[PDB]
Structure 1
Amino acid sequence: TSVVTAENSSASIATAGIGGPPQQVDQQETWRTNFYYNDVFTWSVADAPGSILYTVQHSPQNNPFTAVLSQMYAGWAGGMQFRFIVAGSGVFGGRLVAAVIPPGIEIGPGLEVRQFPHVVIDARSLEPVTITMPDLRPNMYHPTGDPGLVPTLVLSVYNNLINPFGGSTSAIQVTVETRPSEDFEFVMIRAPSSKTVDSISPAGLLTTPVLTGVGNDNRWNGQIVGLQPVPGGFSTCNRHWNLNGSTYGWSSPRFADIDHRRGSASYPGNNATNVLQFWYANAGSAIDNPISQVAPDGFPDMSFVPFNGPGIPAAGWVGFGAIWNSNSGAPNVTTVQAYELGFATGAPGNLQPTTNTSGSQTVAKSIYAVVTGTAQNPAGLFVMASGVISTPSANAITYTPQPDRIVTTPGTPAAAPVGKNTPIMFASVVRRTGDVNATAGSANGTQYGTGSQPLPVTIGLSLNNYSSALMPGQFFVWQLTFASGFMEIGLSVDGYFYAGTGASTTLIDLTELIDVRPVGPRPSKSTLVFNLGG
């Protein structure tokens, strides 16, 4: 075998002797002789000449085996060899340029990689193309924890990609591989406790059994069976956490309980027998909720539908609950019922649905008859957190909610389709009131309820800060593999999830889904693949 050493090799082990004798310097060790996978990027026909497709800074992490060895060593020095395995086709054309940009030069649109010392990679190349990144460093070694100035490896489009067919295929995958060079070394062994870049990548929170096993939504605690796209956009802010340590809304991530103490109660009719109890409060009276004052913790963020009489309302959010008096509260025995909660205006007269939370008032009307009706001014509610959907007859209404019924607070980031990508929404089979036995079989299509993001993701995002873990303008992409196809699923800086379905409103079933796999950050201009089983 032949392992290529760097140009600055003899002065690299010489000046890194301030760390003592070099460690893991044995050239017959396999982890130093073989190339191993590092990354995959995508080269589309929409890429301009001169545009940068791949960028990596010099670091052991670029190799899977020097990233393992760097957690026991407090320092490194030496180069790294990169290989480029274009998937390609013999009908595609266009070249790439790869050059090692020295420290002190910007990496941006104005950079002319073609006038650096470079290597050229064809779109139809069989053998992989190799370049060596030396360790052109001003520090004498890079301590793992603050490495210093490093060279950068930049792939740029030389000639733009052409496909002389037309549609269908428009992007080529290029696989980066990585081997240490002959003068790479480690110094100053440390305890494996912890160190290195002191941040967490957003990769391990979304694993395999989150979609084909356990895993729940943000609205009901239902098992995820589908992703359904929406074209045009939607907004959710209840249990939706963005990539920083913040949210815009109430409802801490737990389906426990809804409890409110102060608010008015009423019932219609002159007779206090077999009526519908109606409870109301304004927005901003929730003193007990430490996150947001606009609602009690666990209140559903849907718009109230105006219904009257004995008719069961279509769609909506009902939950089992009771009303309790204040002053060391013991609830009334003769009122426990299913209640539909929501947001209205003009209570208790002409009730209209509301879109914005400001200027709205929370309402709670019973759907079934109750033999007693109270009207005391201090009163509250106690409603379980998990809910069901009220329906007039069986059949199947629609997936609930629609994108227009979902209430938003002021200052909320909205999902927008960028390119051919479109946002998705996670579906779950939920029980209903028109048919309790809604097993997923025959007797009409079962009801689907859709939340924004998976809860495991909400729990694992709430604690950690990811302000630099994903570079804005891109999304982190996972690779779902079914039994007869595969798909790419993205995750932006706002917590939204993307798939490149385009203008389609068809539910995608995770029945035959097997495994997922991290890839990394990838820009929003690249279309996520849709090679499904169909």
Structure 2
Amino acid sequence: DSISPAGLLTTPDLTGVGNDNRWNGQIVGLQPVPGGFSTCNRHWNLNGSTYGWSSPRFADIDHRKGSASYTGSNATNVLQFWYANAGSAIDNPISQVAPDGFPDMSFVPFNGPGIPAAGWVGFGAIWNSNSGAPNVTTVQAYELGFATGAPGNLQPTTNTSGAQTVAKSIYAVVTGTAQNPAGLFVMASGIISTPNASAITYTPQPDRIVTTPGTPAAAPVGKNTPIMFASVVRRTGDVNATAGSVNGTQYGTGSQPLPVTIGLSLNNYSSALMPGQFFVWQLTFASGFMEIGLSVDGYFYAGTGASTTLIDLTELIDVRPVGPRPSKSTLVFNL
């Protein structure tokens, strides 16, 4: 009579069809996080709910009532700034914390000419709050993230309470605009900012992830360690680079495969799994196999202990359900 969780994760989700829930990139690796991490945005639990502010999809990021500004007395070829307060996203029915799709990363301040490291970047524009019309001189790539102190003392924050949702173009716009209210419109699939062509570490690192009050953390349980799902994500320093680039492979991480997030958002799985258990799947390769476990908070784990080495899924054969297990029982790692 109870719903089964076994179909939440299936072979295509990790062999090329499944995309991650932060970057919408094709999942190709598992990144262990021995230090633990938290994530709420676009992350669902087994009770049908999210602590975040985003639906399980990638469309656009829009807010009608922020403050657009720029520095100096000449609007030509400036960096465009925009911000609103967290809690002001009144048109988002999920949560007013931030616009649906706004990235859960702390802002990396920059004034140029260098490009910030490890920023979430999306393409978009400022727009006219009354008419909807885009300000055509403001289209650019913008870093988006959470901060305090805008506009004058911008500092990263990872707590949504009292934060500001900020945007700043990483390159000059044709003509900046200074207007409050003004709208922001940015496409919801992002790229990673880098200072030059070289790839950087997997992005976001745990200490950049923004969460709302009450978001549960993923902590190690014995030798079981939480994992993120890694995809190869485009970067600003070399937009051609993909897997295997001579300039380095850039990984972006998410807490869940989006198909899992979607399944959790469609049905309540509370009956499927007791708190303190994991539901376990086996990932089989030619050389061996490994188990990953899903907790009631929606986080995945592997039996990798202190390791931070990315697990490559290029040679993954299939995913098979194993069943529910105590979270303390060590997940097999036989690669």
TM-score (norm 2): 0.98
Q: Which residue of 1 aligns with 2:72?
A: 269
- Give the match for residue 193 of structure 2: 390
Q: What is the aligned counterpart of 2:33 among 227, 230, 233?
A: 230
- The residue number in structure 1 matching 2:325 is 522
Q: Find 1:379's aligned residue among 182, 190, 205.
A: 182
* Separation (CA, whole Å) in 2 of partners of 1:268 and 1:217: 36
What displacement does 1:199 show?
A: 2.4
Query: Residues 438, 345 of structure 1: CA spacing in aligned structure 2 closer, same or farther, 3 A cutoff?
Result: same
> 1:333: which partner in 2?
136
| Gapped regions of structure 2 (runs ≥ 5) | none
Runs of 4+ aligned structure 1 residues displaced above 4 Å come to none
Contact 2:23/2:190 (CA < 8 Å) preserved in 1?
yes
Q: How far off is 1:354 after superposition?
A: 0.8
Does the aligned pair in 1 maintain the 2:70–2:79 contact within 8 Å? yes
How far apart in 2 are the matches of 1:222 and 1:365?
A: 23
Deviations 1:73-100, CA, capped at 9 Å, x for gaps: xxxxxxxxxxxxxxxxxxxxxxxxxxxx
How much does 1:384 deviate?
A: 0.5
Aligned equivalents of 2:84, 2:220: Cα separation in 1: 37
Give the drift of 1:263.
1.3
Decide whether the 8 Å contact of 2:37 with 2:217 is kept in 1: yes
Q: CA separation in 2, counterparts of 1:202 and 1:259?
A: 34
Shift of 1:442: 4.1
Q: Distance in 2 between matches of 1:436 and 1:494?
A: 35
SS, match of residue 391 in structure 1: coil
How many Å separate the matches in 2 of 1:334 and 1:503? 49
Supply the RMSD in Å over aligned alpha carbons: 1.1
Q: Contact conserved, 2:3 with 2:271, CA < 8 A, in 1? A: no
Secondary structure of the residue aligned to 2:8 is: coil
Superposition deviation, residue 378 in structure 1: 1.6
Distance 2:248 2:156 in 1: 28
Per-residue deviation at 1:269? 0.8
Distance in 2 between the 1:435 and 1:442 partners? 10
Identity %: 97
- C-alpha displacement at 1:405, in angstroms? 1.0
Tell me whether 1:508 sits opposite 2:311 in the alignment.
Answer: yes
Does residue 478 of the first structure (1) align with residue 281 of the second (2)? Answer: yes
1:202-237 CA distances to partner (integer Å, 9 max, x unpaired)? Answer: 001211221112001111111000001011210000
Post-superposition shift, 1:439? 2.6
Give the secondary-structure state (helix, strand or coil) at the position aligned to 1:215: coil
Deviations 1:277-297 (A, max 9, x none): 111111111111001001011
Q: How far apart in 1 are the matches of 2:245 and 2:210? A: 34
1:318-369 C-alpha deviation (Å, 9 max, x unpaired): 1110111122221222221111111111111111111211011111111111
Structure 2 Cα separation of the partners of residues 399 and 241 of structure 1: 22
Change beyond 3 A, Cα 1:354–1:442: closer
Which digits, 9 at most, give the CA deviation of each residue in 1:377-435, with x for residues without a partner?
12111100111111111122111011111111110110111111111110000111111
Offset from partner CA, 1:243-266 (integer Å, 9 cap, x none): 001111111011011111011111
Say which of 294, 302, 306 aligns to 1:499. Answer: 302
Pairs aligned (count): 335
SS at match of 2:261: helix
Q: Which TM-score applies when normalising by structure 1?
A: 0.62
Match among 113, 137, 144 for residue 310 of structure 1:
113
Output the CA distance in 2 between the equivalents of 1:347 and 1:405. 18
Structure 1: tracts of 5 or more residues without a match: 1-197
